[PDB]
Ligand binder design. Structure first.
Ligand code: NAJ
Ligand code: NAJ
Ligand code: ZN
Ligand code: ZN
Ligand code: ZN
Ligand code: ZN
Lengths: 374, 374
């Protein structure tokens, strides 16, 4: 009943940094060629969405944020072949165009069509599908999931199992897949190894899940909020440490605990200092450190390259290294077959209209993932 | 006969930084338990030896430097089982104790017994075998090859083929193995790939050798000294570029040349700026950059961690990642079987007594490797 028509719906518009979202009516244009309009069902609150608010992650404003979500296709533009109206789908904040050198590479996943490296806040064609108060509103990472309806490019959507529970599998659109893949795919954690995970939010917990799935013998969680430790242990941490409890720097503590450094470390916070600490705490000759956290915009870290010369490997990744469109449906299928759990990540559920309360919960330290329902 | 006796011999002593070596008589104690005394036959001049002179690499002075060498065992201490008097040997500046966690790890080579991380300038037992003018003289990296005789720990020497030409295979003690391994073992260069090699000295040429052996399609040499380009092409470079020729930063040039970044880059100079440039010029999603150059003491680089978050891998290594005592004899065997060439690295051969002239050749840009003969 809405195909080819502008849809008026509610969205959470961010007009200004460091302000609450405004829940108000937007106009959502119909999809153009190779675009898909999605009726959103559930969306998670990821710290990266908060980074938009805080100016940690710079993207043009005003904006409809949201990137961790699931919904049902309302209509498809001309030439769309990979989804149909009524399909369950997860928007892909990292696209998979299938054609660029990265998409063709066996390891690569950071498709050249992404809007993360140099955000413009548009569709692939450089325009916006959103109007609010008569004004154009930017997209975010090609997804913009904080809206009852969004429009995405076909390369930024994956069809998923028709029987999928969308209020759970929305987490596969960012935080679960990111953390889990960072462990299993990017670091390639080995059986019997010792891992250190810095930051015990939704993504860090998913890292722990992956380290445990990979057979790590020890998984040391690191967080300044000791309230995060119980859940970390539930999902596989063998020990947790709070840097504030120690006189010495935590890289020294972790090196001591691991009898000379850990096999694999993960920065899952977004601080320059913890990126360097996480590198330092891995064993100097054969350790591997993976950066997952998003750093403050345009800031450089300082480090001694002797940390690498001895033999350490330092890498980072977006979305756990997963080729997004290939991997998301498989991850959903695996979830359905109980190969991993998502409930440990979900601490709060709210209606979409309570988005600002959801962000308050994240900022206070109380939540892991709040799932918003439309 | 000399076994069990102090040897008085000629050595090149470095009394203080930024001075010529002093060629004079030293006393070399006999080997203690698990030590080996070696009559030197040939030693190369590696830029790392010059770093000791320039204060780029801090190690206790006064010192007998030299670490890239080959000789013949004169005598063995009690308990030595791996070499005998008369054997051809290469001192190992990275030891292989076989017992530490690094030695037991499949990918580690930076044995915990090394004297590089926190240099003490002694034998494993904390003492020196060298005196000169009544004063104790420090060792360098457990090798000290700028002497007619040295004493090394058993874990810092490998037996090699009795038919080996020592005036060539001394380069397997540092520069060749480092560069070749950095390509084939540390980076794991792939067939058909594009590589960039920063620095076209003995080590960088050996990196090129390895990239070509691994089947790279393109190997771009980068040096500010265009006189290095002809030999780089001889050993496999497909193109060479001098950053001084361009208005733009060379990472931008290399990214353009490689249609979006190289597969593998190598820093083989020892500058903070070129370490960051080399990282930046590899493809952002799947590129790998290896630091080989030795940085100036205690200096930190500055970099934006988004370079890693997109998917790059950054690593470094000592001695090409090779487990030293296992690998050196095999590399010599491979050389004797014509699997690689060493002559392209050798531009000058001088008597040991001309050590200062050999260093002047390096510093002036005129040599690759000078081999000093005893
Ligand atoms: N690379 C990617 O594709 C990707 C995907 C998803 C999230 N992210 C980023 O990953 C990070 C974590 O996201 P999240 O799990 O949603 O966030 P979160 O829920 O805010 O978790 C971060 C955790 O870090 C803890 N923390 C804060 N400061 C420190 C400190 N100094 N030492 C130790 N712990 C500390 C904090 O208490 C919290 O539990 C954020 O920077 C995100 O932007 C990256
Ligand atoms: N990691 C290891 O185990 C290991 C082993 C051996 C050598 N090294 C280091 O590797 C480096 C190279 O050693 P080497 O080959 O004997 O030295 P080298 O022969 O002096 O070669 C260095 C090359 O770098 C070139 N160069 C200098 N500045 C620049 C610049 N800004 N941009 C581009 N090219 C430049 C220079 O012209 C020369 O051809 C040194 O720092 C050594 O200390 C490390
Ligand atoms: Zn692509
Ligand atoms: Zn996210
Ligand atoms: Zn060892
Ligand atoms: Zn060397």
């Amino acid at each position: 009943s809405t195909a080819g028509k502008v849809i008026k719906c509610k969205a959470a518009v961010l007009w200004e940094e460091k302000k609450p979202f405004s829940i108000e009516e937007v106009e959502v244009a119909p999809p153009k060629a190779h675009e898909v309009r999605i009726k959103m069902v559930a969306t998670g609150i990821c710290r990266s969405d908060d980074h938009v608010v805080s100016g940690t992650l710079v993207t043009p404003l005003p904006v409809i944020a949201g990137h961790e979500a699931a919904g049902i296709v309302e209509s498809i533009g001309e030439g769309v072949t990979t989804v149909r109206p009524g399909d369950k789908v997860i928007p892909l904040f990292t696209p998979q165009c299938g054609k660029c050198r990265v998409c063709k590479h066996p390891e690569g996943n950071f498709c050249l069509k992404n809007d993360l490296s140099m955000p413009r806040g548009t569709m692939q064609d450089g325009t916006s599908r959103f109007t609010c108060r008569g004004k154009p509103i930017h997209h975010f990472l090609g997804t913009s999931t904080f809206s009852q309806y969004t429009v995405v490019d076909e390369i930024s959507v994956a069809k998923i199992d028709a029987a999928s529970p969308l209020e759970k599998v929305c987490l596969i659109g960012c935080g679960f897949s990111t953390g889990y893949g960072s462990a299993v795919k990017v670091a390639k954690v080995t059986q019997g190894s010792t891992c250190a995970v810095f930051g015990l939010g939704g993504v860090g917990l998913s890292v722990i899940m992956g380290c445990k799935a990979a057979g790590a013998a020890r998984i040391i969680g690191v967080d300044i909020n000791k309230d995060k430790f119980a859940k970390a242990k539930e999902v596989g941490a063998t020990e947790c440490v709070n840097p504030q409890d120690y006189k010495k720097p935590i890289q020294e503590v972790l090196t001591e605990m691991s009898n000379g450094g850990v096999d694999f470390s993960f920065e899952v916070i977004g601080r320059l200092d913890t990126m360097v600490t996480a590198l330092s705490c891995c064993q100097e000759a054969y350790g591997v450190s993976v950066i997952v956290g998003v750093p403050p915009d345009s800031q450089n870290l300082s480090m001694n390259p002797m940390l690498l010369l001895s033999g350490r490997t330092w890498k980072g990744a977006i979305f756990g290294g997963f080729k997004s469109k290939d991997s998301v449906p498989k991850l959903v299928a695996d979830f359905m077959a109980k190969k991993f759990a998502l409930d440990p990540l979900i601490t709060h559920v709210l209606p979409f209209e309570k988005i600002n309360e959801g962000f308050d919960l994240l900022r206070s330290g109380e939540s892991i993932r709040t799932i918003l329902t439309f």
